[PDB]
From Swiss-Prot, chains A, B:
Name recorded for this polypeptide: Calmodulin-1
Annotated gene: CALM1
Pfam families from the UniProt entry: EF-hand_7 (PF13499)
Glycyl lysine isopeptide (Lys-Gly) (interchain with G-Cter in SUMO2) cross-link, renumbered residues: K14
Biological function: Calmodulin acts as part of a calcium signal transduction pathway by mediating the control of a large number of enzymes, ion channels, aquaporins and other proteins through calcium-binding. Calcium-binding is required for the activation of calmodulin. Among the enzymes to be stimulated by the calmodulin-calcium complex are a number of protein kinases, such as myosin light-chain kinases and calmodulin-dependent protein kinase type II (CaMK2), and phosphatases.
Curated annotation (Swiss-Prot), chain C:
Domain notes: The segment S4 is probably the voltage-sensor and is characterized by a series of positively charged amino acids at every third position. Conformational changes of voltage-sensor are driven by an electric field generated by a potassium gradient across the membrane. The C-terminal region interacts with the cyclic nucleotide-binding domain and contributes to regulate channel gating.
Similarity comment text for this entry: Belongs to the potassium channel family. H (Eag) (TC 1.A.1.20) subfamily. Kv10.1/KCNH1 sub-subfamily.
First and last residues shown, out of full length: 118 to 223 of 962
Subunit structure: Homomultimer. The potassium channel is composed of a homo- or heterotetrameric complex of pore-forming alpha subunits that can associate with modulating beta subunits. Heteromultimer with KCNH5/EAG2. Interacts with ALG10B. Interacts with RABEP1. Interacts (via C-terminus) with CTTN. Interacts (via cytoplasmic region) with Ca(2+)-bound calmodulin.
Name the record gives this protein: Voltage-gated delayed rectifier potassium channel KCNH1
Cited function: Pore-forming (alpha) subunit of a voltage-gated delayed rectifier potassium channel that mediates outward-rectifying potassium currents which, on depolarization, reaches a steady-state level and do not inactivate. The activation kinetics depend on the prepulse potential and external divalent cation concentration. With negative prepulses, the current activation is delayed and slowed down several fold, whereas more positive prepulses speed up activation. The time course of activation is biphasic with a fast and a slowly activating current component.
Subcellular localization, as worded in the UniProt entry: Cell membrane; Nucleus inner membrane; Cell projection, Dendrite; Cell projection, Axon
Record note on modification: Channel activity is regulated via tyrosine phosphorylation/dephosphorylation by SRC and PTPN6.
Tissue specificity: Detected in cerebellum, at parallel fiber synapses on Purkinje cell spines. Detected in hippocampus neurons (at protein level). Detected in brain, but not in the other tissues tested; expression is highest in granular cells of the dentate gyrus, in hippocampus CA3 pyramidal cells, and in cerebellar granule cells. Detected in pituitary.
Region (Required for phosphatidylinositol bisphosphate binding): 34-45
Annotated source species: Rattus norvegicus (Rat)
Amino acid sequence: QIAEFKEAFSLFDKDGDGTITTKELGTVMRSLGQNPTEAELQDMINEVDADGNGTIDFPEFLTMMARKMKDTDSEEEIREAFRVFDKDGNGYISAAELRHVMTNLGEKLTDEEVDEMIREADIDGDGQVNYEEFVQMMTA
Amino acid sequence: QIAEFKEAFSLFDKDGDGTITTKELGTVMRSLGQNPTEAELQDMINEVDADGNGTIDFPEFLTMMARKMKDTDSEEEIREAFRVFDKDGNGYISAAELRHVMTNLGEKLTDEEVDEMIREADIDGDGQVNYEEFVQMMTA
Amino acid sequence: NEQDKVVLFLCTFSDITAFKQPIEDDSCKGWGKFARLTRALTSSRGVLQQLAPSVQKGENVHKHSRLAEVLQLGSDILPQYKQECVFKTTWDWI
Amino acid sequence: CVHLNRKVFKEHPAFRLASDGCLRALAMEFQTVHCAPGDLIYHAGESVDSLCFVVSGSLEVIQDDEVVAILGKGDVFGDVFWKEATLAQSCANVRALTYCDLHVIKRDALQKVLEFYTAFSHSFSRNLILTYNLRKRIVFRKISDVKREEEERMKRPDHPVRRLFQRFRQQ
Amino acid sequence: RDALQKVLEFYTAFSHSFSRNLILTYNLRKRIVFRKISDVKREEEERMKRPDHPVRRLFQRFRQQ
C-alpha cells in the first residue's frame, strides 16, 4: 500500500535517475493539459524535496506521503501498538517480543501467561500474531 | 360459470341469429311436453327482452341472470371488494391497484407496506393476488 | 436485448483529476494534493497515456484517445445480455 | 479436499485467518457444483441452507422477473447462518449465465465447524461479507409501474377493509 | 469415543478398573508449556538492548482472565 505508490513515481521521472527534475515535471504538467508557471514548479520542488537540489528522492517524498496519510485514529493507535510491540519491525510479534515489552512496560507476567496470550491471540497456529489477530484482541 | 350458460342458449335459438324468436320458443316448449299459450310466450319475451322487438340478445338475458344469481352475502361482499380493487377488471390485483385504492380510499401506506401486503397475500409467487388469496385475507 | 428491451445500463469510469484541475476542500500542500491526484489517475495515465508524458497537449491527444477507447467499448456494448453438422456426416460418408 | 478448495481458501479474506485443522475440517465439507448455463441453483421460495462461493462463472439473481445481482468470480451468496440460526426461504431465483464452478457448504456442517473452531468463527463473521443475502427480500418498483402511475392522472365502503389496513397498522 | 463411551456405560464395573489402569502416554488435549533454547539465546542477547496504559489494562484483563 505504502510502497505501491512508486510505480506512478516511475511515471513521474522521465530521465530514470531516481531524481525528479523540473523539466520532467513541466513535461508531465503540460501533458496534464495545464500550462503552469515554472517558478511555482520550483516552489513545489523546494517545498517537496528534502535534498533541496532541484530534485527529490522517494524517501524525501515519504515524509510528505506520511503527512498526506491522515487515516483514522483507531487504526493509527493500533498501528502504534503494533510498531512498538514488533521491535524487529517484521510485522510479527514473537513471544520474546511480548516478554520484553512486558518487562519494559512494567506489567510482569509469568512465562505461561506469555504463551497463554500467544496461544489465545493466534488463530492460524504459527506461534506469532498478525495485525488482524492483534485487532481481534484490540476490539474487546 | 357465468359464460358457461350460453351453450344451452345455443340450444335455445333454432335460427342461429343471436335473437330468440317466438316460434323457436314454441317449438322447444312443445318439445318440453307442454302446450303453452303463445300470448304468455309473448309476455315472457316482453318481460325478458330489453330490446323489446320480439327477440332478445344474451346481454339482454344477462340482467335477468344476475337477478337470478342470488348468491351468499359474504361471497357477494368479497366479490364487490375484488371488483373495486381490480380496476382493470382482469381478475388480478396489481401493486399499482393496491396503491391507487390506498390513495382513493384514504388509507395511505408506504410503498414497502404495499409490497408487504402483496408479498404476504400472495402464495404462489406471481406478484399479484387471486380471489382465493383474497379470501385468505378476507377470512381473518 | 434479444427482445430489444433496455434491460441494463453500463457505466464505465476513469480519473480525470489531473487532466482538468486540482480542487481540494483541504489538503496538506499543493504538491500533496497534486501527488494524490497523480496516484489516483494511475491506470488512466499509465496504461493508456503511455508516450503522452513525452508530448504536450494531453487533453488534445491522450484524453481524447481514452474517450475513443470508451467509444470502442460502446461499440463493444453489443452483447446485449443474451445467449451467444449433417453436411459433415454426409461428406464423411461419401 | 484442501487442494480442491484452494480456489476458495487462497482467494477469500474469510479463510486466511483459519487454522490448518480448520482448513481441513472445512474442506472435508465442501461440495463442488458444476452449474450448466441457464440452470438455476436456488429457485425463489426454496430453502436457503448452504452459502455458496463462486470460484468460476457468472450468475444472475432474479427477483420478480428482474435481474437484481450479477455474481462474478469470488462472490459469496446464500445466507449468514451463524448470526441468524434460522432457516429462510429464497426470496429470489439464482440462475447461472456461464459454466459455473461453485463450492458450496451446507449450514449444518458449517455450524459444526464454527462451533468447534470458536476463535476462528468471530474472524469469519467479521471477514465474510455476503455478496447477496438470499433471505432479505429487496423492495423496489418497476419503471413500467411508475409509467402507469403517471398515466393514472387521467383517472383522477372501505371501512370493512381499511380496518384490515388498520390491522396492517396492528401489523 | 462414542463406541468407547457406549461400552463403558454398559460395563460399569469394568470402567473403573479401566480408568485406574489406562495411563495415557500422551494427552493430546493438554498443551505443554516450554521454551526453546534459541529463545533464551535471544534473551541473553537482549542485554544489549538494556503508552502501555491502554494495553496493560488488557493485561489486567489477563489478570481478570
